[PDB]
Amino acid sequence: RFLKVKNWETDVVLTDTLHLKSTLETGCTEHICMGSIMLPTKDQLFPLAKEFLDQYYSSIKRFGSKAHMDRLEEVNKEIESTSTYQLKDTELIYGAKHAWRNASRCVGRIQWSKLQVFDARDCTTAHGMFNYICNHVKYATNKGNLRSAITIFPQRTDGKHDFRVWNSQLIRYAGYKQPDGSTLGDPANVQFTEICIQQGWKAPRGRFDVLPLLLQANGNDPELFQIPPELVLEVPIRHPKFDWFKDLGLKWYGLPAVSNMLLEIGGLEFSACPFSSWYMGTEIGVRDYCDNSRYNILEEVAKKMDLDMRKTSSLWKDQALVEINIAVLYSFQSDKVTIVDHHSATESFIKHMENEYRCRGGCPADWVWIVPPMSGSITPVFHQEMLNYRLTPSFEYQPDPWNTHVW
């Protein structure tokens, strides 16, 4: 069964055979589409393993080879014997790269092949985790010349000895709920901040406090560690034409490092797998700065611009938004910290997507996430149809550890 996707700006059509290899469910049915919903055993394990191994071996052009069968045989026995198994270094790398390749919500995926993979499966303690993580941050930041990396901690076993990173990103600002009801710093992290504090963190209480790492190894209680400040690259936010802008007091960190996700490879579950790359401007300028439930800076930025804020139809929110995003890309570029604007980013993903249909017969994409949170229809992805299906290896969500942890 073939499927076609049209680009309504170029009339380009692509045929998707890849969705055929789909496994997981979408949350959608014949009678309902949940495309905008944010979150919709030995015998179990071997099929999963076999499938992965087949992919891998096909990818290296040894499908059916003796090597292939042997490995198949080996893994087989190992699962029967140990009720789990271990991936060869090559497989772990292939698996990680490909989970990224399959991340339908990622516009960055043209880069999927150039990924630095750190094997931290020999890790056993939170302190071990802290050290590994520090190495990742440093390698990835690279003095502002950002590099994509992932660090993979030991896989789950009985589910009672999970490695987990309790932060949602390696580096994020704290959130303090004041008594008057307002919030200081980043409201997104208010709850995590309360857990840190509650666990011993001496909170400075500022609008941009780098949070402590809170690391759980082997199922043990989480432990706090401060990331060497020297390791935390930051960009002060100023506007190329508004000298009053810097006075707003805004900065952001240069390294987005999602840490709360779950990497699945050949049936194996890696519950702690921080990955990092570089920001698209909008993530910060639009979502982090202007979301009503984040830093929410539109009013203030507007005021300083003296815009007509009486009537929404002045598009004062829109005007401010553009400046704010101009100031973010500007600040970063001026400090030579890697960053990409939403136009370049989306243009590349079209190129990527095309190439993926050519060489792979498809490329799963979540339109809702792929399209930037501003200027949607002026980027090429708006006009681009996308089929969304779920391929493994994958990155999955998982519950916040505090909701599930057995203290």
Ligand X SMILES: C[C@H](O)[C@H](O)[C@H]1CNc2nc(N)[nH]c(=O)c2N1
Ligand Y SMILES: NC(=[NH2+])NCCC[C@H](N)C(=O)O
Q: Residue 397, interface with ligand X (CB under 6 A)?
A: no
Respond yes or no: is residue 109 known to be catalytic: yes
User: Whole-number minimum distance, CB 75 to its own copies, in Å?
Assistant: 27
Respond yes or no: is residue 106 known to be catalytic: yes
Residue 313, marked binder: no
155: burial class by Cβ within 10 Å (0-12, 13-18, 19+)? buried
Residue nearest to ligand HEM (CB): 108
Residue 36, marked binder: yes
Q: Residue 385, interface with ligand X (CB under 6 A)?
A: yes
Q: Residue 38, interface with ligand X (CB under 6 A)?
A: yes
The C-alpha atoms of residue 259 and residue 267 are separated, in whole angstroms, by 20
Q: Residue 12, interface with ligand X (CB under 6 A)?
A: no
| Pair 237, 297: CB distance under 8 Å | no
| Largest separation between any pair of C-alpha atoms in the chain | 74
Nearest to 320 by CA among 221, 248, 395: 248
Q: Which amino acid is at 379?
A: T
Sign of CA dihedral 356, 361, 366, 371: positive
Catalytic choice (278, 290, 316, 363): 278
Q: Residue 19, interface with ligand X (CB under 6 A)?
A: no
- Residue nearer to its own copies on the CB measure, 34 or 60: 34
Q: Residue 279, interface with ligand Y (CB under 6 A)?
A: yes
User: Which residues make beta-bridge pairs with 394?
Assistant: 264
Q: Residue 35, interface with Zn ion (CB under 5 A)?
A: yes
- Residue nearer to ligand Y on the CB measure, 169 or 379: 169
243: burial class by Cβ within 10 Å (0-12, 13-18, 19+)? exposed
- Interface with ligand Y (CB under 6 A), residue from 133, 233, 284, 370: 284
Residue 397, marked binder: yes
Taking CB under 6 A as the criterion, which residues in 285-314 touch ligand Y? 287-288
Instruction: Spell out where the chain is interrupted, by the residue before each break (C to N > 2.5 A).
Output: 40
User: Whole-number minimum distance, CB 92 to its own copies, in Å?
Assistant: 27
Q: Write down the residue that tokens 């707003």 correspond to.
A: 248
The C-alpha atoms of residue 210 and residue 78 are separated, in whole angstroms, by 43
- Residue nearer to ligand Y on the CB measure, 372 or 380: 372
Six token digits for residue 372:
């930037």
Q: Which amino acid is at 19?
A: H
User: Whole-number minimum distance, CB 186 to ligand Y, in Å?
Assistant: 9
Binding site for ligand X (CB under 6 A): 8, 36, 38, 368-369, 382-385
Binding region for L-arginine: 169, 278-279, 283
Residues known to be catalytic: 106, 109, 278, 283
